[PDB]
Symmetry: C3
Subunit: 376 residues, 3 copies
C-alpha cells in the first residue's frame, strides 16, 4: 500500500480528510490530516532527535549512589541510542565492572536497554560506540568523602559528588577526576600532576607538580609534550589550568572545596610527592585531608596557587620576572591556599598566604583546578 | 489494517515502495519509504521530544511585561506538555492570580493550551504537575524599577527584568527573587536574610543578615538548620552564597546591579532590619534605593561583602582568625560595596570600602548574591 | 483512506493490533500499536524538533578551516531548517561570498541542502531567514594567527579559532569579532572602540577608546547613543563591557589571550588610534602584536584595564572619585595589562601595571572584552 503523496509545495494548499495520512516526498515523512488544516501535521524523522537525553529532574545528576560499589540510573530517564528509545521508569541498577581505586568510569546506556559502567571512555566491553552511548560517569575514589571535619577513610568507593552526566557536569574540557562542591562548582579531586598532558589535571597515584617538579609545558602554549617549565611560577600553573579549561581556585571556592578536611593539621615530614598517597615521612595519612566532597589532599599537603591577587606587593618599578613576557609594576602577591606539609596548625580550608609574587617558585607550591557547574 | 513490519535488522536490507509505510517492531515506530533508500526513514516517538521548549528569539526571555500586573507569552513559542504540542502564534496574555507584593510567581503552560501564573511552584490551582508545565516565572515587586537615578516607587508591579524561563535564567540553584542586570548576569533583588535555608537568599519582608544577626549556618557545611554562625565574617556570607549556587558581587557587577539607585544618599537612622521595608529611623524610604533592574536596597542600606580582595592588609604573620580553619598571612581586605544607613553622601553604586579583613563582623556588613546568566 | 481514531482519553484504554496505526485527534498525530501496550506509541510532530542542531562531536565547533578562504561543515551534522532535515554525512565545503579583511561572516544551512556564508546576519543573498538558517560564523581577519611568538602576517584569512556555532560559542550577547583562546574562554579580537553601540565591542578599522577618546556612554546605563563618558576611568570601561555581556580580562585570561604576540616589544611612536591598523609613528606594524588565537594588537599597543584589584592603594580616607556614585576608602589599583605603544621592552603577554586607581584616565589605557565559553 502506497499512500497519496506530494511535494511540500503541493501539500501547502492541500487539506486531507480527517485521519488521512499522506507522504511529503520532499521531506520523506508522514503528514497527518484533520480535514481542516491546510498542509496537515508533518511528523518528525527520528534523526532529528538523535542524542536526545531527558531526565525527570534536570536539576540533579541522572544517577544515584546506592552503595560503595553500586549505583542506579534514575526513574524517568529517556535516552536516544542507535535509533532507539531506551528508558527507565524506575531506578535501575547500573551493571558494574571490577572497580579499581582511583579510577574514572564512564556510564553507557546501550541499545539493548542495559546501563553499564566501564573504564574505557570509548565503549564498554562487548559493545561499540554505536550500540553503547556514553551518558555520564564517576570517580571510584581511594577512600570515603568526609562525614564531618576529620577527613575520610581508605575504603575505595564511588564518590557520589563525582557523578556527572552529559547535562549535569563540569564546564571543563574533560569531566574526569572532578567533584561537585555544594552543587555550585567543580573541583579537581587531585592536585595537578607533572604529566597532565597525558593524564589530565586530576589523576590518582601520579607525581605532584610543584616548584621542584615543574609541570609539562602546555602544548597549547608552545610545549612539545616533553619539555617542562623552568620553574613553578603562578604563571605556569595558571597556563596549565587554562589549557584544560580550568582555573585556579579563588578564596570562596577554596574554603568550599576543602570543607571536611581535618583543620589545623598538616601532612608532616619532608614532601608530598604523589597524589592520593601518603607524604614522605608523613605523620598524617593522606585521607586525613579528604574533604566532604572527596577532594583529596585538600589542605595541609601542598599550597595551591589561587586566581586572586592582593597582599604584599613587589617593587614599585618595572620588573622583568615573567619568563620573558614583559614587566610588572607594584605586582601584588598571588594567593596561595590550604597550607602544606610543613604547616602544622596553620593549614586548613581557609589557610591563605599572600606573600608570594606570581614569579615565585617553591617545592611546596602547586595547584588544583576548578571550573563552573553546567546544568543543561 | 496492520502494516508490514519487521525488526531493525530486517529493515536494514529492505527498501519499501515509494510512500509505503512499514512498522519497525524493535522500535515500535513507523518507517516511511521512498523506493530507493534501504531501511527507509524511521519516525520519532513522541517521548524523545518530551520537555521540548522552542522560542522564536532564543536570545530573549519567553515573556513580555504588558503592564504592572499583566504579561504575555511571545509569538512563536512551542511547548511540549503531557504528550501534546502547545503553541502560541501571536503574543498571548498570561492568566494571572491575585498578585501580592514581594512574591515570586511561576508561569505554566498547560495541556489545554492556556498559560497561567501561580504562587505555587509545583502546580497552578486547578491543575497537576502533569497537566501544567512550569516554564518560567517572575517577581511581583513591592515597587517599580528605577526610571533614572532616583530610585523607584512603591507601586507593586511585575519587574520585567525578573522574568525568567527554563532556557533564559540564573545559573543558580533556584531562580526565584533574582533580576537580570543589563542582560549580563543576575543579582538577588533582596539582601541576604537570616532564614535563607527556608526562604532562599532573596526574599521580601524578612530579617536581614549581618554581624549582629548572623545567617543560619549552611546545612551543606555542617549546619543543622537551627544553628547560626557566631558572627558575620566574610567567610560565613561567602559560604552561604556557595550553598545556593551564588557568589558575592565583584566591583564590575556591583556598579551594574546598583545603577539607578539614588547616589550619594543613605537610609539614615540606626538600622535596616528588614528587606524591602524602611529602616529604623530612616530618613529615606526603602524605594529611594531601588536600582534600574529592581535591586532593592541596592546602596545606602547595608554594605555587601564582595568577592574581591585588596586594599589594607592584615599582619605579615600567620593569624588564626578563620573560625578554626587555618591561618592567614598578610591577608588583604575583602571588598565591601554600596555603603550603609550611616553613610550619608559616601553611599552609592560605586561606594567601596577596602579596610575590613574577611574575619571582621559588624551590624552594617551583610551580603547580596549574584550569579551568571544562562541562555540555552 | 482514513485511519481509526480517537481522543487521548479514548486511546488510554485502547490497545490496537500489532502494527496497526491510529490517529489521536486531540494531538493530531499517529499512534503506532504493538498489540500489547495500552495507548500505543504516539509519534512526534515535526514542530517539536524545530531548531534541532546535532553534531557528531559536540565538544568542537561544527566547521573546519580548510584554507585561508575556505571552510567545511563537519560530517555527521544534522540541521532542522524550514520543516526539513538537512544533513552532511561527509565534510562539506561551505559556499563563500567575496571575503573582505576584518569582516564577520554568518554561516547558514539552507533548506535546499546547501551551506553558505554571508556578511548579512539576517539572511544570505538569494534566501530569506525562513529558507536559510543561521547556525554559526567566523571572522575573516586582516592577517594570520601567530605561528610561534613573533606575531602574525597581513594576509587576510579565516581565523580558525573565531569559528562559532549555535552550540559552541561565546557567552556574550553577540558572538561577532571574538576568538576562542585555548578552548577555554573567548576574547575580543579588537580593542574596544568608541562607537561600540553601533559596532559592538570588537570591530576592525575603528577608532580605539581611551582616556582621550572616551567610549560612547552605555544606553543601558543612562546613555542616549550620542553622549560619551567624561573620561576613560576603569568604571566606564567595565560598564561598557557589562552592556555587551562581557568583562575585562583577569591576569590568567590576559596571559592566555596574548600568547603568540612578539614579547618585550611595543608599537613605538605617539599613538595607536585605530584597531587592526598601524599606530601613529609606529616602528612595529600592527601584526607584530597578533596572538596565537588571532587577538589583534594583543600587547604593546594600549594597556587594557583588567577585572582584578590589588597593588598600590589610594588614600585611607573616603574619596569621592567615582563620577558621583559614592566614595571609596583605601581603594586598590585596578590592573592594567599588556603594555602600550611607549612601553619598549616592558610590554608583553604578562605585562602588568598595578598603580592606577579605577578613577584614573590616560590616552594609553583602554580595554578589551572577554567572556566564558559555552558548549551546549
Ligand atoms: Ca584582588
Ligand atoms: Ca578577583
Amino acid at each position: 500500500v502506497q499512500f497519496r503523496g506530494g511535494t511540500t509545495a503541493q501539500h501547502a494548499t492541500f487539506t486531507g480528510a480527517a485521519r488521512e495520512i499522506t507522504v511529503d516526498t520532499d521531506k520523506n515523512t508522514v503528514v497527518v490530516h484533520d480535514g481542516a488544516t491546510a498542509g496537515g501535521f508533518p511528523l518528525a524523522r527520528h534523526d532529528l532527535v538523535k542524542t536526545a537525553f531527558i531526565k525527570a529532574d534536570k536539576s540533579a545528576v541522572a544517577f544515584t549512589r546506592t552503595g560503595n560499589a553500586t549505583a542506579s540510573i534514575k526513574a524517568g530517564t529517556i535516552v536516544e541510542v542507535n535509533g532507539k528509545l531506551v528508558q527507565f521508569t524506575a531506578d535501575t541498577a547500573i551493571t558494574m565492572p571490577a572497580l579499581t581505586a582511583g579510577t574514572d568510569y564512564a556510564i553507557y546506556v546501550c541499545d539493548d536497554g542495559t546501563v553499564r559502567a566501564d573504564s574505557n571512555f570509548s565503549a564498554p566491553t562487548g559493545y561499540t560506540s554505536t550500540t553503547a552511548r556514553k551518558v555520564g560517569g564517576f570517580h571510584y575514589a581511594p577512600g570515603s568523602n568526609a562525614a564531618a571535619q576529620a577527613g575520610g577513610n581508605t575504603t575505595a568507593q564511588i564518590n557520589e559528588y563525582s557523578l556527572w552526566d552529559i547535562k549535569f557536569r563540569p564546564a571543563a574540557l574533560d569531566p574526569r577526576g572532578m567533584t561537585l562542591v555544594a552543587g555550585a562548582f567543580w573541583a579537581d579531586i587531585y592536585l595537578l600532576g607533572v604529566n597532565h598532558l597525558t593524564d589530565g589535571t586530576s589523576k590518582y597515584n601520579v607525581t605532584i607538580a610543584d616548584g621542584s617538579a615543574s609541570p609539562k609545558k602546555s602544548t597549547k602554549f608552545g610545549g612539545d609534550g616533553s619539555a617542562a617549565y623552568s620553574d613553578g611560577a603562578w604563571y605556569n600553573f595558571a597556563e596549565v589550568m587554562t589549557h584544560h579549561g580550568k582555573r585556579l581556585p579563588n578564596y570562596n571556592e577554596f574554603q568550599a572545596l576543602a570543607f571536611g578536611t581535618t583543620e589545623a593539621t598538616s601532612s608532616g615530614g619532608t614532601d608530598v610527592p604523589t597524589t592520593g598517597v601518603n607524604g614522605t615521612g608523613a605523620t598524617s595519612a593522606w585521607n586525613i585531608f579528604t574533604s566532604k566532597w572527596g577532594v583529596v589532599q585538600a589542605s595541609g599537603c601542598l599550597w595551591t596557587w589561587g586566581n586572586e591577587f592582593g597582599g604584599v606587593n613587589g617593587a614599585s618599578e618595572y620588573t622583568a620576572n615573567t619568563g620573558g613576557r614583559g614587566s610588572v609594576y607594584a605586582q601584588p602577591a598571588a594567593a596561595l591556599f590550604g597550607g602544606a606539609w610543613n604547616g602544622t596548625s596553620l593549614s586548613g580550608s581557609r589557610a591563605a598566604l599572600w606573600y608570594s609574587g606570581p614569579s615565585f617558585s617553591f617545592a611546596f607550591f602547586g595547584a588544583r583546578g576548578v571550573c563552573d557547574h553546567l546544568i543543561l
